[PDB]
Amino acid sequence: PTVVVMDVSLSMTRPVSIEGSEEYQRKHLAAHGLTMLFEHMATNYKLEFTALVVFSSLWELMVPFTRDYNTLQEALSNMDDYDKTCLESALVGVCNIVQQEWGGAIPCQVVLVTDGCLGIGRGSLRHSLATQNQRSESNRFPLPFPFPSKLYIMCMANLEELQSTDSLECLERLIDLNNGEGQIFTIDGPLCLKNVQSMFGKLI
Amino acid sequence: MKLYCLSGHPTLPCNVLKFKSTTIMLDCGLDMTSTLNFLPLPLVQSPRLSNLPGWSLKDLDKELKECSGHVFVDSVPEFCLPETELIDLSTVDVILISNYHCMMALPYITEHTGFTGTVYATEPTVQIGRLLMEELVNFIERVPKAQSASLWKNKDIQRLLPSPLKDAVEVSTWRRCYTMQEVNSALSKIQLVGYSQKIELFGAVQVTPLSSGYALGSSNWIIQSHYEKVSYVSGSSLLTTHPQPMDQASLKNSDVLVLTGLTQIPTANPDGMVGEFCSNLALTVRNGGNVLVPCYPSGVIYDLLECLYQYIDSAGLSSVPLYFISPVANSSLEFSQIFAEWLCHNKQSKVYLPEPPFPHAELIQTNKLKHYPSIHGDFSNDFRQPCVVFTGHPSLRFGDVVHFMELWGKSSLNTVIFTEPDFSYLEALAPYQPLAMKCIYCPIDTRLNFIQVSKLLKEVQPLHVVCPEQYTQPPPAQSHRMDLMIDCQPPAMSYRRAEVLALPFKRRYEKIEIMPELADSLVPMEIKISLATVSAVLHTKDNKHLLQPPPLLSGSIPVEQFVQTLEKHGFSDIKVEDTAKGHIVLLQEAETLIQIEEDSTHIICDNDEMLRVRLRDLVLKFLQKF
Amino acid sequence: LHRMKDLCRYMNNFDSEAHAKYKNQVVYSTMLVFFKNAFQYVNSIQPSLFQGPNAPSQVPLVLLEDVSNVYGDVEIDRNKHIHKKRKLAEGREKTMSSDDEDCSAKGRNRHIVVNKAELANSTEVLESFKLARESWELLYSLEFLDKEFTRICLAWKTDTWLWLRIFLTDMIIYQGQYKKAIASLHHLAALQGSISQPQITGQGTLEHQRALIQLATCHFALGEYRMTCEKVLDLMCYMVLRKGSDLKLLPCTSKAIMPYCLHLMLACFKLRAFTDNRDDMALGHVIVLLQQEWPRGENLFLKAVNKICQQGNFQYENFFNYVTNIDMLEEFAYLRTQEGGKIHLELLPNQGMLIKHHTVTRGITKGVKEDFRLAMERQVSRCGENLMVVLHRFCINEKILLLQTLT
Amino acid sequence: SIPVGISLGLLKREMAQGLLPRLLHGTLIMKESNFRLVSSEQALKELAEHQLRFTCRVHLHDTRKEQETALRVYSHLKSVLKDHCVQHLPDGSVTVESVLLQAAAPSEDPGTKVLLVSWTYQDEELGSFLTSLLKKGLPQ
Amino acid sequence: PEIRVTPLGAGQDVGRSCILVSIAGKNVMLDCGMHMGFNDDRRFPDFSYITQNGRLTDFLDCVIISHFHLDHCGALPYFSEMVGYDGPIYMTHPTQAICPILLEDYRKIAVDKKGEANFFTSQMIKDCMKKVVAVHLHQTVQVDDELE
Amino acid sequence: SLWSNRINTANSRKHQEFAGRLNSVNNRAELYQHL
Amino acid sequence: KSAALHIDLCKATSPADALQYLLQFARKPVEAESVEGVVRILLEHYYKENDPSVRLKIASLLGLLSKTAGFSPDCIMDDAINILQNEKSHQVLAQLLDTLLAIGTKLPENQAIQMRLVDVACKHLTDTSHGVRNKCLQLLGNLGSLDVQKIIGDYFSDQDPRVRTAAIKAMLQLHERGLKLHQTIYNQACKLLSDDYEQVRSAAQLIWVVSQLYPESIVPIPSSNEEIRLVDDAFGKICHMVSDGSWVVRVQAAKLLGSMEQVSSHFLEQTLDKK
């Protein structure tokens, strides 16, 4: 009854400005994942099962059908990336897959972990998709679909790195897409990320 | 703020700390390793040393003698003193003895340098130090030898000499042994203080020793100035040892920490070493041999003989006698017995009952443990061939150990053990190299090892740590074991011999006292927090600043409320205008002018009594006393 | 200042021969008093230049005028550009040594900006600077008084004697004239070189440390991109261990000397970015060197990247060598993808030269991937290295390779 | 006794003054379970710190010139104060403790001479007493 | 700022020394003496003075003994055990060694007078003294956060 | 005043009391009241 | 061969190796001309170097050189007082005051040099550091003979006990020189007897000195109107001072009390009985 997604983007390999909090690459930590929270969730929820499905632009598979998630995670490693960074199409496909699988009457939550990289000025066309009543031109906009769904993006980075790489700006745009239906952290800089542990504890 | 380090030895520190308006000499720490180069002093002149060959000298071979490819100085042994010439020792006022080992070479500093301050220590340290000093002086003076080799100390000859002498540092600073008269002179200046006894220096600095747990009487010192604390760490033990258990809580929240007295050869486990030593002597007795154990009369022989009697009672090999020979052997045993308060909780529980702490008194009463002041003092008549002997100095350059091991050197049946982790035993056996004697090096080191001190630091988390550069590097024996490496999140700087260090701590506020009338002078006013201001004369005596009776004004007045109050007051000729460079109003009531400008403010008040009173009342309505 | 303002207020309103003479005498006396006060403040604040270093004095320090307003990317003087600005700096006058002009009155609106943590007595320094500024404004309040003061300063012959030069430098520092201070520092360095001790043609040394600091401050204050680039190249090749001009206090130790090269490089990059003659290579270099200030610098770098985008025929020898910041690498990676340019590029060390030697293909792609992996491993090996070493190495390499290419 | 801390610079200045009559001010801020004293310059680090200073005007009526009268006043004060003043200021100003005495012209009126003097309350009481003593009688 | 002192016993006489002080709200027990000849069970102080019944450790956090003489430590056993007390007790080590046998001999002497109906016991003396904390000479032990 | 507030803080640091001091008039206290 | 020393010092790195080289040069002996050269080399490097510890070592070596018997230390005294005027660090200042003690002991005949030393000493006595104050008081005590007595007497009331001990030791040294003492020092030392610390009380010997100097002198009791000789009141002072708990002070008091043999026996009989 849960979904875990790990980002292995090459951008995350480089540090924020000089180095990281743990003196290690952020991409490596993201690939490793939250070891403590995942271990606690796995141990407490022994009767929990999950599956991994990857589909961005074309059908592909790297982890065979197996109940154990550790085998799938191990099989996911040692793979080559593809020239594709679609966001709207990937989100639409994920929503369609979720609707086909869980239907429209099963109470469940869907969470997708994606960086959502974009640009300033040049990538201003993304605002049209986020707005449904954007004049007569966007009046017949399929996005958002007529079903209960929501997209959330969570990340933490320094202010200079966020401005340069559009990390926090992308998160703000994503939050503003849903008419600001969420909270925004006020702290910035070299502050820790203890909120993740609290969120993991509250959720389990 | 300034720390001066004089001795380059790891376990024998000699440091001077300049702390505020006082300066503290930390320890004396005689470096005994220098004596290893010299030829030993036999109690009875052996033929071997007399027929020992000299060594070639271009510039006259009697100066030096050589054995086993190692050149040795054929003169009286000399000791490497700390580099005391770096700082004028007359200036320093306090000396903080940590243990009986670290107080060695105290006569040199007290007498030669003209030091006139005071010294502090614990009673067992003073007594055991007196014992060690008198016994070593006795060893030197039993068979006097002339200072017959001095020209070898030149740097040119040292370069011409091989590595075992070239490695020596500051040979010129080496000195001959002091005399018992100087020892009596030095110990006169010492003051006795127990564990956790606050001592105030000139009303400025508080100093307190805490139980180190390494040996009875051994203590770790702290230095406090209320807002600044400096903690000094010496030889300490967390193991199940006889003295009072090591204190850990008191060292917390320490600004600067000084680390000393870590274990030499840290890999050795003392319990396994003691068991192996028991096995070695057991098999030696089984073969019919004799075991020689050079060691001090300190705590090492005490817990060694404890485990030893327990082992032989377990094995039933109690038939052989115990021989402990030293000029202060009986005194050392009785001093160990009487000092029961300084021991651990088990010993204090034992002495709550009428029984003495240690059980070797029972052996003495039943005559199963025997000791004599020397060899000639009736020990010769009572000596038996199959036995185990503890005697002499662990440096093997003097003491009865020299004669004993010369006697037993030829026979391979006999055995010699080493238990003191303070010298390289290969160097010690070098003057006696051609022997069939079986030698085993199994030192017992009860001090803190690297992992224990690392655990201590992680539990305490001091801001800064200071230690010799030897700890900062891996040992030369391994040079690859990164586990034996002191780890600290702060940089944890280090030093070498004669290296001056400046403390990073720069706290800029000390204590002061206030009497209640000044406290009542304030009338705090709510803002959000309380505010106050006072004015008192400063009185100081014996570095104790005091405040007793014989301030700025911040009258933040809002514009709108001031305008309302001025209008309500009824003063005539009120004009309000809005122009550039702020608001300017001309008032002709008393030729007053009020100007408001950014980053500036000017106040004009006449000398009229009534106008002064009205202005004072108006300010007092909205006065913040700060 | 209050007494001077009151005197001037009464003097200006009154128009009489005796009143004018009294005003002139009061102005002369006030100028003398202000000069004495400035000299006393200079002697008390930092007497290091007054006597030998071993002599007792306060903590050493160096004075440099802030150039934050000039260094601003948005504040680009496109109206004048470089040629007209250089002509205005020349002023249609001879280049020979001159002083005693005081062709600026920015001290009245100038304020001392400094962090309280940098020095405990920073409040006293700011108060002294404000008092000196007020005294200078009072001296320059009247045209006749200012002319008389300038004539007196010219007649004093400050450029002749060493003590006179030091006094002139202190007065200029109090007022704001950095050029006079730089000239005095150069004269002091020349005098030190003239002594029996070894002398060099303005090389980095402990004796010439003050001259180097003054030169760096002048370069930072001015918008001279060529001079800043030349100074940065010289330092890399041979290293030695509101409105108006602002003032700040910084340490005179090696801490300020070390960041001087980085500050000079950042100023040169900002000047190049603000230059009218925009170029793809210059924009990329500026963007790589713009990771020092935000958010204006980030916006400028993004605009430069968008302008370049997919130029393709870009000349760059050690573009990746100078880049050390992760933000520049992330921006370059984003630009190389379909979002920015949709064209392949080179980011490994010396990748551009290698790429230009052969056609891009599957084998070239595999080689580039291997080179990128090796570069990533090398970066992981020494991840603790700062960007100062990378910038210095890149500057040294550029100076060794194509120093003569400039101008 | 109330335990509080003192800034090192203030204590250094106090000891220097005591070594070679002057009384020390006191400014403290209530802290979390403790109290700390801080100097005026150091208190400004709390920023805000808006400093306000009073400047009272002392009016005298005499036909004598300014500078010569100022020199006479300086001589009289240095004689009365038992040579406690061993410092001078470049613009003909003499300061005692923390009060500045300088010559300033009036605003607009030429027929009356007025000067400005600024002080704190502890200096204000002493200044008022000294001015009253001077007004009581002088060789005028 | 107030200091509260109210000694009971030996204030105007000898024996039954017991000085109760609450210097800053921290009750300190300075001595617990007795006086022979009080066959009416007046040897010990009035435990009810602190409070009628209840835990002594709630009120007291420090107990001090001068030396082994019964006029300074005679009433310690019954006060510590019978009334009920397990809080900290501080006294010198040689006093801890000399005290128990003296108390036991005195208890036996009282048994010889057949007045042992409401008197001490050997086992409770051993239990209480085993719980007593020793102190060394000049040992500036911080027994509380503010009290030493 | 600051002293007043400080003494209030010091007084606020309070704990249990004894019934005999509460009952004490003329300072002297009664021991073994039953006897 | 001063060239070898000069080049070796120049090649030596300033922060650390310089200290070791100077120590090694200090341990080996020196000659008169060699001293005359190395002192100027040390002064030049002292000007060049600005570290505290290095300058402290240079001052210590200057003191060691000043103790050389065969040397003629005249110009180096001038350079020493010059650097004294220029010195800032208090530890190095105290070391240079040690060198001034050395030079004063070496050459006690030149009166002009003596007054130069005492005036610069009292100038540097204004410093807040206690050590330099102690050294200056030692100079004042050593250099005397026919205002200095009143100046050091003013410093009796200093807060630091070490300075007070230095003051009383300087008084004892001055008495050893044979200068005629005053009588106001008696009450000042009487005030000092109430001091908490032990060395000050033990030194305050001074009342014994003043009692020996003027035993027949009449002194009035501050409270009682009766007149008592200096000898008898000093005897009573030592008598009730022997009750002090400092055993070294008790031994000192008894020993110096024995040296008094100019007092009436009736008072001794009165004060020795138990009632």
UniProtKB/Swiss-Prot annotation, chain A:
Which tissues is this chain's protein expressed in?
Answer: Strongly expressed in numerous cancer cells compared with their non-cancerous counterparts (lung, prostate, colon, stomach and skin).
The VWFA domain covers 1-203
A single Gene Ontology CC term: nucleus
**Could you tell me the Gene Ontology terms of the biological process aspect for this record?**
regulation of transcription elongation by RNA polymerase II; RNA polymerase II transcription initiation surveillance; snRNA 3'-end processing; snRNA processing
Q: Which UniProt keywords apply?
A: Acetylation, Magnesium, Metal-binding, Nucleus
Where does this protein hold Mg(2+)? S9, S11, T85
Q: Where in the cell is it found?
A: Nucleus
Superkingdom assignment: Eukaryota
Q: Of which family is this protein a member? A: Belongs to the Integrator subunit 14 family.
Q: What does this protein do?
A: Component of the integrator complex, a multiprotein complex that terminates RNA polymerase II (Pol II) transcription in the promoter-proximal region of genes.
Describe the subunit structure.
Answer: Component of the Integrator complex, composed of core subunits INTS1, INTS2, INTS3, INTS4, INTS5, INTS6, INTS7, INTS8, INTS9/RC74, INTS10, INTS11/CPSF3L, INTS12, INTS13, INTS14 and INTS15. The core complex associates with protein phosphatase 2A subunits PPP2CA and PPP2R1A, to form the Integrator-PP2A (INTAC) complex. INTS14 is part of the tail subcomplex, composed of INTS10, INTS13, INTS14 and INTS15.
This protein's name:
Integrator complex subunit 14
Name of the gene this protein is made from? INTS14
Q: Which residues of the full protein are shown?
A: 2 to 205 of 518
From Swiss-Prot, chain B:
User: Where is this protein found?
Assistant: Nucleus; Cytoplasm
Predominantly, its location class is nucleus
Glycyl lysine isopeptide (Lys-Gly) (interchain with G-Cter in SUMO2) cross-link position in this chain? K58
Q: GO terms for biological process? A: negative regulation of transforming growth factor beta receptor signaling pathway; regulation of transcription elongation by RNA polymerase II; RNA polymerase II transcription initiation surveillance; snRNA 3'-end processing; snRNA processing
Family annotation (InterPro entries): Beta_Casp, Integrator_9su, IntS9-like_C, Metallo-B-lactamas, RibonucZ/Hydroxyglut_hydro
Per UniProt, 1D-myo-inositol hexakisphosphate binds at K2, F19, K506, R507
Q: Does the keyword Cytoplasm apply?
A: yes
Coiled coil (residue ranges): none
What keywords is this UniProt entry annotated with? Answer: Cytoplasm, Isopeptide bond, Nucleus, Ubl conjugation
Any one GO CC term of this protein is: cytoplasm
Q: Quote the SMART domains the UniProt record gives.
A: Beta-Casp
Q: How does it assemble?
A: Component of the Integrator complex, composed of core subunits INTS1, INTS2, INTS3, INTS4, INTS5, INTS6, INTS7, INTS8, INTS9/RC74, INTS10, INTS11/CPSF3L, INTS12, INTS13, INTS14 and INTS15. The core complex associates with protein phosphatase 2A subunits PPP2CA and PPP2R1A, to form the Integrator-PP2A (INTAC) complex. INTS9 is part of the RNA endonuclease subcomplex, composed of INTS4, INTS9, INTS11 and inositol hexakisphosphate (InsP6). Interacts with WDR73; interaction is required for the assembly of the RNA endonuclease subcomplex in the cytoplasm.
Q: Which PANTHER family match?
A: INTEGRATOR COMPLEX SUBUNIT 9
Known role:
Component of the integrator complex, a multiprotein complex that terminates RNA polymerase II (Pol II) transcription in the promoter-proximal region of genes.
Q: Can you say what this protein is called? A: Integrator complex subunit 9
Name the species this protein comes from: Homo sapiens
From Swiss-Prot, chain F:
Query: What disulfide bonds does the UniProt entry report for this chain?
Result: none
Q: Where in the cell is it found?
A: Nucleus; Cytoplasm
User: Which stretches of sequence are listed as region Cleavage module binding motif (CMBM)?
Assistant: 1-35
Tell me which tissues or organs this protein is expressed in.
Widely expressed. Tends to be up-regulated in seminomas compared to normal testis.
Q: What is known of its domains?
A: The cleavage module binding motif (CMBM) mediates recruitment of transcription factors.
Q: What does this protein do?
A: Component of the integrator complex, a multiprotein complex that terminates RNA polymerase II (Pol II) transcription in the promoter-proximal region of genes.
Which family does the similarity line name?
Belongs to the Integrator subunit 13 family.
Q: How does it assemble?
A: Component of the Integrator complex, composed of core subunits INTS1, INTS2, INTS3, INTS4, INTS5, INTS6, INTS7, INTS8, INTS9/RC74, INTS10, INTS11/CPSF3L, INTS12, INTS13, INTS14 and INTS15. The core complex associates with protein phosphatase 2A subunits PPP2CA and PPP2R1A, to form the Integrator-PP2A (INTAC) complex. INTS13 is part of the tail subcomplex, composed of INTS10, INTS13, INTS14 and INTS15. Interacts with transcription factors ZNF609 and ZNF655. Interacts with PAFAH1B1; this interaction may be required for proper recruitment of dynein complexes to the nuclear envelope at prophase.
Q: What is this protein called?
A: Integrator complex subunit 13
What gene name is given for the protein in this entry?
INTS13
Curated annotation (Swiss-Prot), chain G:
- Choose any GO biological process term that the UniProt entry carries and state it: regulation of transcription elongation by RNA polymerase II
Q: Which UniProt keywords apply?
A: Acetylation, Cytoplasm, Isopeptide bond, Nucleus, Repeat, Ubl conjugation
Record carries keyword Nucleus: yes
What are the subcellular locations of this protein?
Nucleus; Cytoplasm
- Which superkingdom does the taxonomy of this entry point to? Eukaryota
* GO CC annotations, alphabetized: cytoplasm; INTAC complex; integrator complex; nucleolus; nucleoplasm; nucleus
Q: Which GO terms describe its molecular function?
A: protein-macromolecule adaptor activity
**Swiss-Prot/TrEMBL HEAT repeat ranges:** 32-71, 111-146, 147-180, 181-214, 228-264
Record note on quaternary structure: Component of the Integrator complex, composed of core subunits INTS1, INTS2, INTS3, INTS4, INTS5, INTS6, INTS7, INTS8, INTS9/RC74, INTS10, INTS11/CPSF3L, INTS12, INTS13, INTS14 and INTS15. The core complex associates with protein phosphatase 2A subunits PPP2CA and PPP2R1A, to form the Integrator-PP2A (INTAC) complex. INTS4 is part of the RNA endonuclease subcomplex, composed of INTS4, INTS9, INTS11 and inositol hexakisphosphate (InsP6). Interacts with BRAT1; interaction is required for the assembly of the RNA endonuclease subcomplex.
UniProt function note: Component of the integrator complex, a multiprotein complex that terminates RNA polymerase II (Pol II) transcription in the promoter-proximal region of genes.
Q: Which family does the UniProt entry place this protein in? A: Belongs to the Integrator subunit 4 family.
Q: Tell me what this protein is called.
A: Integrator complex subunit 4
Q: Span of the full-length protein shown?
A: 35 to 324 of 963
